[PDB]
Every structure is written in structure tokens, then in C-alpha cells.
Amino acid sequence: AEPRIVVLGAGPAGAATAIGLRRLGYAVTVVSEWRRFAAVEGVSQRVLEGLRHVGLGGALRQAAMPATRQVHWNGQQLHLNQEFLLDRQRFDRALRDDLQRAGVSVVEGRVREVVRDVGHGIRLDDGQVLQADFLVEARGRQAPLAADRLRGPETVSLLNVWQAAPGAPASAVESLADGWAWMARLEDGRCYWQVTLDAAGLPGKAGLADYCAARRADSALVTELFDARALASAEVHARSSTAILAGECVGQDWIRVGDAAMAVDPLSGNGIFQSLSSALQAPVVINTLLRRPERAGLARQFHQQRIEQLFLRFARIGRDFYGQEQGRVGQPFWARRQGWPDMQALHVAADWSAVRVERRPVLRDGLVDEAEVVVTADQPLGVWHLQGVELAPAVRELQAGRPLEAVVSGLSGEQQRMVRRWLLEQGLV
Numbered sequence: 001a002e003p004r005i006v007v008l009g010a011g012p013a014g015a016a017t018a019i020g021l022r023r024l025g026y027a028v029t030v031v032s033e034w035r036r037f038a039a040v041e042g043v044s045q046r047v048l049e050g051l052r053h054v055g056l057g058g059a060l061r062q063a064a065m066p067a068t069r070q071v072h073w074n075g076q077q078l079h080l081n082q083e084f085l086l087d088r089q090r091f092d093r094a095l096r097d098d099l100q101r102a103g104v105s106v107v108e109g110r111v112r113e114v115v116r117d118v119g120h121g122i123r124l125d126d127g128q129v130l131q132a133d134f135l136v137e138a139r140g141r142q143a144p145l146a147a148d149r150l151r152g153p154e155t156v157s158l159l160n161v162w163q164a165a166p167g168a169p170a171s172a173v174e175s176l177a178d179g180w181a182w183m184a185r186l187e188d189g190r191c192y193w194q195v196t197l198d199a200a201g202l203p204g205k206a207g208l209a210d211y212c213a214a215r216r217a218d219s220a221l222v223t224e225l226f227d228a229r230a231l232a233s234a235e236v237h238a239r240s241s242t243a244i245l246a247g248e249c250v251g252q253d254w255i256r257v258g259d260a261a262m263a264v265d266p267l268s269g270n271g272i273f274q275s276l277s278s279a280l281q282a283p284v285v286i287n288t289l290l291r292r293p294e295r296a297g298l299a300r301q302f303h304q305q306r307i308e309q310l311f312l313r314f315a316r317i318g319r320d321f322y323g324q325e326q327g328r329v330g331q332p333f334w335a336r337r338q339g340w341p342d343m344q345a346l347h348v349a350a351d352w353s354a355v356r357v358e359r360r361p362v363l364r365d366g367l368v369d370e371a372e373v374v375v376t377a378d379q380p381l382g383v384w385h386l387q388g389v390e391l392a393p394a395v396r397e398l399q400a401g402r403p404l405e406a407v408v409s410g411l412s413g414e415q416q417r418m419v420r421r422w423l424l425e426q427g428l429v
């Protein structure tokens, strides 16, 4: 009498969630399409061990290759390295091995339609119908269009892909007047160029090839890095790269993870990590939805609020990157992106007067429960405990006028010093 869990999509987020469910003891089936266009992304040192932290590190090193990287930004020609390139062709095909290794069924196929048929009726292009008691939606930006909770400045990434001479790997980033470009050349000679711009005023389909060709032809970086440019014959692709927080991300028997839940624009070079963050606690939410469905409200709130806070944090991190470009002051592309989503600092200022004790969702023993937590400026979702020491009783007593020394007198001296340091950081000084 075990639930049928089906995950749609086998990118980083779907794969991560599937393996997490396996570790909780769940049988899991993943459905996803074999491949898509040739895309290579920039990945940091963190992402790759973060990707093995989740258990996808096998899918990793034959898809990732080291490469130098010229960075042009704020008037500085800067030659960084120790960041890699990830070939999503190798990567996604390799993700399926790690899933089968973990005991996950990988049913290849494009999903046609999902229907409310007792459970979930997942109808595939080849006519097969897979029944799901629980559905994980993990098809990335290709997820079915729902309403948005938040939407940033409309943004498009235009991509050129072509073939050049092998054996000369490199990558680069340059700030342009009305956008920025990322480009890469793999060791086998595959070439990549992707420019990120405001969606407004771009040409239609027929004009995109000429538009990209002129931009590549205008770049001294493109000339240096690429001997053959294939200005006329390069494939041309257009990707929506708008920052999007999904309107709905969890139900009684479904959950969205990854880009299907939230995605910010790709300036950070950290999207895969950010998508993994959105799936990190998806398995415990599912575990609650299945083992204690009476607590679905709490579990749903836990996932929604985590996803929204992640989205906002990554959006502000990206904003600060845009803000490092200080030589573009009259340009609408940059001004719009240097002030979005807002001007709030990444670490908010304390306000002890505003601290509240509230009953909020918490994680305990693999299930979303509810507990009195302490809500602060820096933690809108609340802090439950520090190393087992629940804070709400202390803060209740402090707000009732009990002196701090008495409030903490029952803990060990080390726990007393731990609690005092937290209170200082929350503005009780």
C-alpha cells in the first residue's frame, strides 16, 4: 500500500528530489526527455561538490571541464580561472546513471499532458499513461505556465551555437551597453555565445540571426576567443531568462521544484546550485504530505515560504552583481536591473522591538510540524532552536521583563553564551 511517486523531468532539481526520496525509503520513478539543444554553462567550485553532496557527482566530471575565463566588467580586464564549464548534453544524459544507481526508474519520454484522474494521469507522447499518487513537477522553465507570484524585468537570452577548431578551451564574460554576454569554447571545438538583454524591442524570429551576427561581429572578445565564428550559419536560439517565482508551488499531492518553482536570471553563474537549493527540503515536504497528510497546510506553507525567500535572496545576489557595473549610468538595461527586486541589503538590520514569537512551520524528524519560533528582521520565517535550545520561551520571558541572567540561568554556561550571542545579533544589546 506504498504511494506511487512520479517525478517529471530529470534535470538537477528532479534528480536531486528523486534521490532524496530514495534515502527516505520511497520507491520513485522519473520521466524525462533524453536531450535538448547544446548548452554549456559556467559552474563554480561550490556547485560541483554541491552536486555530489546531493549524489549527482558521478554525472559530473565527464561533463565538466576546466577552462580559463576572461571577465570584462566595470572597465576592468580581469583574468580569473578555477571555474569550469558544464556541458548540459553530457550532464543530463549522465544524470540518468546516478538515478538508476540510486534505484530510480528512468522512463524516457516527453510528457503530453497530466490530468486529474483519481490520482495523476501522466500521458506521454508515445501513448503510455503512468499513474501517480504523488507528482513532482521538475521540468524546469518548460514547466506548464502558471500565474506568477513575482516577475522581474522581462529578460531574453539569445544564443548562438556553432563548431570551430578543437583544442583551445576558454570562456568569457563582457558587459555591454544594453546587456551582457557569456561565451565559451569547448576543447572539442563546440562554441557558445549567449547575450542577455531586455525582451522589449528585439526583432521577431526572422530578424534574430542578423541581430546576433552583428553583436558577435562587434565584439573584440569574440574575435580573440573564436577563430571561426560561423556568423551566417550558427544556430540561433532565444530563451526567456526572466526572474520568475511560481504562483503555486505545492499541492495536496504535488510539488514544484527547481526552475519550475523559482528561477532568477543567469548572471550569477550559479543557477544549478540555486535550483538544488529549491529541492533540498522538497523530500521532507513530500514525506509530510504522504505520512501525515493532515499536516498538508503546514507542509505547503513550509515549501512556499522557503521558495519565496530563496528566490528573493538569489534575486538580490544577482542585483549586486549588476550593481558592480558602475560605468553604465544612463542605460535602461542596467538601471532597471540594479534596483530589482528592491534595494534591501542581503543582511537586514536588527530591530529587537519588532521581534515576534509566533507559531510557524518547522522541520522535525523528517516531517513539517509547527512550533513557537522567534520571528526577526533577519529571519522572517523564524528561528526555532539553537543546538536544541528553543528560543521562544526565553524571548517570551524577556518580552515579559524577566532579566536575561535569570532567563538563561538553567542552561549550561556554553549554552548561556550561545543564547546571549544570538540575542546580540537580533538587536538586544
Ligand SMILES: Cc1cc2nc3c(=O)[nH]c(=O)nc-3n(C[C@H](O)[C@H](O)[C@H](O)COP(=O)(O)OP(=O)(O)OC[C@H]3O[C@@H](n4cnc5c(N)ncnc54)[C@H](O)[C@@H]3O)c2cc1C
Pocket (backbone or CB within 6 Å): 008, 009, 010, 011, 012, 013, 014, 015, 031, 032, 033, 034, 035, 036, 040, 041, 042, 043, 047, 092, 109, 110, 111, 112, 138, 139, 140, 141, 142, 143, 157, 194, 239, 240, 241, 257, 258, 259, 260, 263, 266, 269, 270, 271, 272, 273, 275
Ligand atoms: C540562459 C540561461 C543561462 C544559464 N546559465 C547558467 C550557468 O552558466 N550556470 C548555472 O549553474 N545555471 C545556469 N542557468 C540555470 C540552469 O540552467 C537552471 O538553474 C537549472 O538547469 C534548472 O534545473 P531544473 O532541474 O529545475 O531544470 P532543467 O535543468 O531545465 O531540467 C528539466 C528537465 O526536464 C526535461 N523536460 C522539459 N520539458 C519536458 C517534458 N515536457 N517532458 C519531459 N521532460 C521534459 C528537460 O529535458 C530537462 O532534462 C542558466 C539558465 C538560463 C535560462
